[PDB]
Design a protein around this nucleic acid. Structure first.
Ligand SMILES: Nc1ncnc2c1ncn2[C@@H]1O[C@H](COP(=O)(O)OP(=O)(O)O)[C@@H](O)[C@H]1O
Ligand SMILES: Nc1ncnc2c1ncn2[C@@H]1O[C@H](COP(=O)(O)OP(=O)(O)O)[C@@H](O)[C@H]1O
Ligand SMILES: [Mg+2]
Ligand SMILES: [Mg+2]
Ligand SMILES: [Zn+2]
Ligand SMILES: [Zn+2]
Lengths: 555, 192, 623
DNA sequence: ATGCATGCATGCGCATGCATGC
DNA sequence: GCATGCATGCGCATGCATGCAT
């Protein structure tokens, strides 16, 4: 029996690999496969738009018959690389595709798309440890001593149905030779439906993805990534001699949904580097960014500058005695109701790529820190990350900070101080790093700020957590007619012109790129800066004299 | 409670219903059942198979109590009811004027009636709760005193001593005649 | 047909073929027969519309079949499994006879509906097993898609031949011998080369509203197949037409012994959304078949009259005396504001809905208004005082009924998405419960972060709250803020606050008594159509004059509220005004917001709080 | 004859109700 | 007037022991 379609696909794909001429006249894939000599490389990346310009028939056949054709494409690639270079026969090879011009929602993955080539988007929730997995094992018969090789395991431990010797007909006595077997890398990941695809009154759906070989490396927890692959049924009506199933997604490539100073410089293109250089040589960068991130908000430039300084962050250091010095900055805001207090947190949500936001009692103790659960296919254990861990090296926003329970506040204080989360549960002891920066919003006890009382008497916050915050901002609503007029003008202008009332200088992508580039720098402290800081601190301490009215916060 | 011996607790029995005898018995009813006593498989467990199930001026309410001539027509009108046409009555009094006996008489006279003394039937005693099933093995909702007293008369003694939640539930029953429950695992509207 | 049945295939086929061409109803009106000539046969026109559009599904009413004849209706109800394929093949034959060269994806299927409605599920008997049943209920749980095999693919180990087997009677008999090499037990099943179909499990909560004494609500399980998957959402009130099934239960998975008591089960074949009492849903608003041109012209002519606004306020609730301002506010909430998009700005979601609070003595009809709103508006929810917990709303953790999927389960607020949530006895609610409302009333989103769960949910809900004074009486000596005892942050999020007081007027008492005694002894469909057309067609926009008017109104409100004792004003209140103005723009069917809408919104805001009668410098109201 | 489902503790995570202490 | 300490039900998973259906 012959598989005609598979043979034609093999021929066409080999011809495409051998013949595809690039824009410069050479062949990209020959040079790319020249790097497959290294034992650490097994997958070759092939673009789909280039295939669209070579053979539409082959493209349609591959798209509509991906699962049936893929092993034959792997065999063709193996033959090509074996012909082009001296490689040991034990090595295997795989193909990947990236540029699919269409996307499908998670809820749109019906049973009619089983075995077809699709591209989806999602958010990583959990990852499992790397494992080996069988591909085609070899079985030895215990009766007639006949060796049976190349039996497909699919997705279950399947022994040979019957001995290939007609006289033997053995079906229940076999031995597995692990030495001569065939292995491949295997990892399991969980993904979640994004908020933008949620219908009315619905909870986001969860899906399982499996990564093989090099694709195992990527897809870390907390990311927002696009996956390319197929939909394949895995067992979990009855059969008889003359059935429970579930859906599992196999992915080929994982990409960012919206995409070491020398490495960053090399990665960036010429135009991106030109834009970065243009930004770097502007003093108005200190002012323009304030207008860039908060266009609609009127006034409150101090809060904007504090938020920018918190976003940029400092340089952490370690001492010779074994102690550690904080390098992150935490900011707290307190103000009268409706004084634009919650808008900054939402702006940080929208701007920052790694940000987690919580409010009041909606987050439990297990919601923060982390959790430990079992591995489904081994004796190991896996850790589910909390809000703080997902915001590692990022910004964590907490609204209604006063409503949080005392235990939760103690946990937050521990995370701020030690910058480490220790878990000793279910026979598992572990320590994890949480280098986060906290932006918090709070309200007065009486609902309005008392001008005649100190800061400590106005907020129901414990002294330890109070002392850890670097900057405190206080907002008071002034009963001034001009301020009300100015606020009304901006609100009505925003409502009148939905999108035409914004004149940003730099796009958010450029700001993100510049922040990523700038956070790598580790500036030093000059000698004269030491004396300047000493004198300025002396003046600041002298400000605390008794010859002036009492201040709301001591130094 | 009359047949319970001294210092003991009432015992329970299980009855199976099949055929046209189904849909006759309801919770809270006093019934008489004629049946067969059979075991289930050398110890064994027993059960009952039902064959027959049966249910067990005019202002002369509680003649045992002297006086209160004008306090008895109101009870009769409460029992008769209006044409929502429901009626609610509260009696406030100094101790020793025997308010409890009138409530007990009203409870005994009414066909569907429930009587509450205080915190002994608070919270879960009213409203409803979710419990496992004997047959299906799943969760079902069982109502409280208010649910059982649907289309009947309920009597409450020592009303001022009840908890805030119970008082709010009673107010909701009085004004809206339906109870709304929305907690973890429960989302229901009960008719009372 | 199988033994035990009196159904004849040929007779039923001929009867259905004749019925599809002969049925004409004179009582049918243009109010529901949209785009169909009543003088001509109805189902033939439906088939023609199917041919024009290409939809492979046809809807047939059971009442029409019963009107044509009773034998066919009885046979269809008794034995749907044999009757339905006959109808399908007859329809396919007629369609292919009348319309050659048509292009579709598969043969036309027929879906019956509006069978005799069973009053209560618990009244059913084993005699009704495998019969057509119609139910009315609300969806609370929908599971994920499940694949079910239909064909099986087998491959040989030695010769590798391709064979296919079709499922029969729910069981697949795998061949024990090959077809080319004749080797025994040489065939292996391949799952990925097979064919699968979608299956979904849904949960319904039953509420016929005529329950007997002491009967608790019921929960039913439904199974949907093929395209019917994901046609409903949690919180929707739907009518389900389907079949009744009984399935045995195994004693344990690995032992073939089964329990004698069977398990109830229902298969779904048809869904209906329209209700004779409630307003149109969002599903209907995304279609063009709702309104005939005559009704559109009538509504457009009606909208031109100046008093129609007040007329609508007169037609909202005729069973409650006066309260014109409250009815106008309820109508404006029903119309809603413009749903602008601020994704590019980075500000986030903007609330386009109106929240209303009503404060007054217990002897008031606010509860009647809340009940009427709950019964009238679809996707409506009701809560009362301490009966609801903080975890009861939003979502709570519950395991999947079979495995450990950690399935978050929606609450009352989430089920109220794109709907109305009514709260009674708002005073008794604890601070923990109000913490949820603090985020819900503004951000329209809920953030959940518990063990293994981190997610955000949509909570686009408009809230009607009812409250009472401290002592259940409005003490004239105490101020409004003292009487209310609610935090300023919570009160600031309410667009309209209505203070209900008793003026003790003799004429008012006489009118109330006369109306109450007489209780012993506009068309709703027109109102529904007008509301749906206004809500699904027009997106209002505001001009410079409205801008200046709003600025002046905001500064005047701030000056008025600067005095102590009264409810102070905040910039957020300004936004509320805009929303109200937009609502007025929907009343007059105008795409442009004018100064009249701003003036009306200002008047309503002023009259709602009774600021005119209230003493500006003492906070005491005295009419 | 052998491997597996089930009965019986026990930890885990959670929500809910009753009491009290500032 | 409310958050918290102290039981207690609920739902679940996990580990240790054993008893026999295919
Ligand atoms: N200084 C300001 N500039 C512009 N808009 C403001 C300002 N202050 C308040 N607002 C408007 O008022 C609203 C305040 O709501 P919010 O920020 O949620 O208040 P809070 O955070 O104090 O609860 C926002 O929608 C914002 O548009
Ligand atoms: N008007 C009355 N006529 C006859 N007996 C009475 C009267 N008032 C009180 N009693 C007697 O006094 C006792 C009062 O006890 P109880 O009913 O518990 O009082 P309360 O209901 O007020 O707590 C009863 O046992 C009753 O026999
Ligand atoms: Mg806020
Ligand atoms: Mg008494
Ligand atoms: Zn052999
Ligand atoms: Zn063969």
């Amino acid at each position: 029996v012959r598989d005609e379609v598979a043979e034609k696909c093999q021929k066409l794909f080999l011809d495409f690999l051998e013949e595809f001429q690039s824009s410069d006249g050479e062949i990209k894939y020959l040079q790319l496969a020249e790097e497959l000599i290294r034992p650490e490389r097994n997958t070759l990346v092939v673009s789909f738009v280039d295939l669209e310009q070579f053979n539409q028939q082959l493209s349609t056949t591959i798209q509509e018959e991906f699962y049936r054709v893929y092993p034959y494409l792997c065999r063709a690639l193996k033959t090509f690389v074996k012909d082009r270079k001296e490689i040991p026969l034990a090595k295997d090879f795989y193909v990947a595709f990236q540029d699919l011009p269409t996307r499908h929602k998670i809820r749109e993955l019906t049973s009619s798309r089983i075995g077809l080539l699709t591209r989806i988007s999602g958010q990583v929730v959990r990852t499992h440890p790397v494992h080996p997995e069988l591909v085609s094992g070899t079985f030895l018969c215990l009766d007639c001593q006949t060796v049976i090789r190349d039996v497909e395991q699919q997705f279950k431990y399947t022994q040979p149905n019957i001995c290939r010797n007609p006289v033997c007909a053995n079906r229940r006595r076999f031995l597995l030779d692990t030495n001569k077997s065939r292995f491949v890398d295997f990892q399991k990941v969980r993904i979640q439906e994004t908020q933008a695809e949620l219908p009315r009154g619905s909870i986001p759906r969860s899906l399982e993805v499996i990564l093989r070989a090099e694709a195992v490396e990527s897809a870390q927890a907390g990311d927002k990534c696009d996956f390319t692959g197929t939909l394949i049924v895995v067992p979990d009506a009855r059969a008889e001699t003359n059935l429970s199933y579930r859906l599992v997604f196999l992915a080929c490539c994982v990409a960012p949904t919206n995409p070491t100073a020398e490495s960053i410089k090399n990665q960036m293109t010429v135009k991106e580097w030109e834009k970065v250089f243009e930004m770097s040589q502007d003093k108005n960068l200190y002012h323009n960014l304030c207008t860039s991130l908060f266009p609609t908000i009127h006034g409150n430039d101090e809060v904007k500058r504090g938020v920018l300084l918190m976003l940029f962050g400092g340089v952490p250091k370690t001492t010779g005695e074994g102690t550690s010095l904080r390098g992150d900055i935490n900011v707290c805001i307190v103000g009268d109701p409706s004084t634009a207090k919650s808008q900054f947190l939402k702006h940080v949500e929208e701007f920052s790529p790694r940000a987690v936001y919580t409010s009041g009692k909606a987050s439990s103790a297990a919601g923060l820190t982390a959790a430990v659960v079992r591995d489904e296919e081994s004796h190991e254990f896996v850790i589910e990350a909390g809000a703080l861990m997902l915001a590692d090296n990022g910004v964590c926003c907490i609204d209604e900070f006063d409503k949080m329970d005392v235990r939760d506040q103690v946990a937050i204080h521990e995370a701020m101080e030690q910058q480490t989360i220790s878990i000793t549960k279910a026979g598992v002891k572990a320590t994890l790093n949480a280098r986060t920066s906290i932006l918090a919003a709070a309200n007065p006890i009486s609902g309005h700020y008392d001008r005649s009382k100190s800061l400590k008497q106005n907020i129901n916050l414990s002294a330890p957590i109070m002392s850890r915050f670097d900057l405190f901002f206080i907002l008071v609503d002034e009963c001034n007619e001009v301020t009300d007029y100015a606020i009304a003008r901006r609100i009505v202008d925003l409502h009148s012109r939905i999108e035409e009332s914004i004149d940003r200088v730099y796009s958010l992508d450029d700001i993100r790129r510049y922040l990523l580039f700038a956070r790598q720098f580790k500036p030093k402290i000059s000698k004269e800066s030491e004396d300047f800081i000493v004198e300025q601190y002396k003046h600041l301490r002298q400000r605390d004299g008794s010859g002036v009215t009492k201040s709301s916060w001591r130094i | 409670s009359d047949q319970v011996p001294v210092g003991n607790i009432p015992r329970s029995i299980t009855v199976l219903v099949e055929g046209e005898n189904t849909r006759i018995a309801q919770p809270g009813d006093h019934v008489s059942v004629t049946g067969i006593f059979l075991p289930i498989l050398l110890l064994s467990e027993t059960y009952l198979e039902a064959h027959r199930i049966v249910k067990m001026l005019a202002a002369s309410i509680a003649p045992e109590i002297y006086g209160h001539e004008d306090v008895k027509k109101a009870l009769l009108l409460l029992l008769v009811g209006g044409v929502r046409g429901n009626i609610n009555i509260c009696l406030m009094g100094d101790p020793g004027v025997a308010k409890s006996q009138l409530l007990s008489y009203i409870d005994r006279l009414a066909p569907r009636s429930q009587y509450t003394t205080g915190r002994g039937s608070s919270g879960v005693g009213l409203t409803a709760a979710v419990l496992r099933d004997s047959v299906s093995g799943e969760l079902t909702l069982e109502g409280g005193a208010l649910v059982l007293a649907d289309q009947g008369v309920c009597c409450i003694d020592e009303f001022d001593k009840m908890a805030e939640a119970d008082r709010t539930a009673i107010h909701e029953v009085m004004e809206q005649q339906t109870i709304s429950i929305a907690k973890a695992g429960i989302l229901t509207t009960l008719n009372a | 047909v199988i033994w035990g049945t009196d159904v004849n295939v040929a007779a039923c086929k001929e009867n259905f073929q004749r019925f599809l061409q002969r049925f004409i109803d004179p009582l049918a009106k243009e109010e529901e027969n949209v785009g169909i000539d009543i003088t001509e046969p109805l189902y033939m026109q439906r088939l023609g519309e199917i041919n024009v559009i290409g939809e492979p599904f046809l809807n047939v009413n059971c009442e029409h079949i019963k009107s044509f004849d009773k034998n066919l209706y009885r046979q269809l109800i008794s034995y749907p499994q044999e009757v339905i394929p006959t109808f399908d093949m007859a329809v396919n034959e007629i369609f292919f006879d009348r319309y050659p060269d048509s292009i579709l994806e598969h043969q036309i299927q027929v879906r019956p509906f509006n069978a005799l409605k069973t009053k209560n599920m618990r009244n059913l008997n084993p005699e009704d097993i495998d019969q057509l049943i119609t139910i009315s209920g609300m969806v609370i749980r929908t599971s994920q898609l499940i694949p079910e095999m239909q064909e099986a693919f087998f491959q040989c180990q030695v010769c590798a031949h391709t064979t296919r087997v079709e499922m029969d009677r729910g069981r697949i008999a795998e061949p024990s011998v090959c077809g080319r090499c004749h080797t025994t037990h040489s065939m292996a099943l391949i799952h990925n080369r097979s064919l699968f179909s979608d299956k979904q499990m849904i949960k319904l909560q039953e509420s016929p509203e005529d329950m007997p004494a002491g009967q608790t609500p019921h929960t039913v399980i439904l199974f949907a197949h093929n395209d019917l998957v994901d046609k409903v959402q949690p919180g929707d009130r739907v009518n389900v037409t389907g079949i009744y099934r009984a399935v045995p239960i195994r004693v344990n998975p690995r032992v073939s012994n089964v329990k004698s008591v069977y398990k109830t089960h229902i298969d779904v074949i048809h869904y209906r959304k329209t209700d004779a009492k409630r307003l149109h849903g969002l599903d209907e608003e995304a279609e063009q078949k709702l309104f005939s041109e005559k009704r559109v012209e009538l509504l457009k002519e009606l909208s031109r009259k100046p008093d129609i606004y007040e007329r609508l306020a007169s037609a909202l609730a005729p069973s409650i005396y006066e309260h014109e301002d409250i009815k106008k506010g309820i109508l404006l909430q029903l119309f809603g504001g413009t749903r602008k998009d601020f994704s590019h700005t980075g500000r986030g979601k903007f609330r386009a809905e109106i929240n209303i609070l009503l404060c007054g003595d217990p002897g008031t009809s606010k509860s009647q208004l809340l009940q009427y709103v709950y019964n009238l508006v679809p996707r409506g929810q009701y809560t009362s005082g301490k009966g609801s917990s903080a975890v009861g709303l939003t979502a709570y953790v519950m395991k999947d009924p079979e495995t450990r999927q950690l399935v978050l389960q929606t609450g009352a607020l989430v089920l109220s998405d794109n709907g109305i949530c009514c709260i009674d006895e708002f005073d008794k609610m604890n601070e923990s419960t109000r913490s949820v409302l603090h985020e819900v009333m503004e951000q329209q989103t809920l953030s959940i972060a518990k063990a293994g769960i981190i997610c955000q949910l949509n909570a686009r809900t408009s809230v009607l709250a009812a409250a009472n004074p401290i002592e259940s009486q409005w003490n004239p000596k105490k101020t409004t803020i003292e009487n209310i005892q609610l935090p300023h942050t919570l009160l600031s999020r309410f667009d309209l606050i209505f203070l209900m007081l008793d003026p003790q007027d003799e004429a008012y008492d006489r009118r109330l008594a006369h109306h109450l005694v007489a209780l012993y002894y506009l068309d709703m469909a027109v109102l529904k159509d007008y509301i749906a057309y206004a809500h699904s067609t027009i997106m209002p926009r505001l001009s410079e004059e409205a801008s200046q008017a709003l600025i002046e109104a905001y500064v005047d409100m701030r000056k008025i509220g600067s005095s102590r004792g009264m409810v102070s004003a905040y910039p957020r209140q300004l936004e509320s005004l805009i929303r109200l103005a937009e609502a007025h723009a929907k009343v007059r069917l105008s795409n442009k917001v004018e100064a009249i809408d701003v003036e009306e919104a200002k008047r309503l805001h002023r009259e709602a709080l009774k600021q005119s009668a209230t003493d500006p410098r003492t906070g005491i109201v005295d009419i």
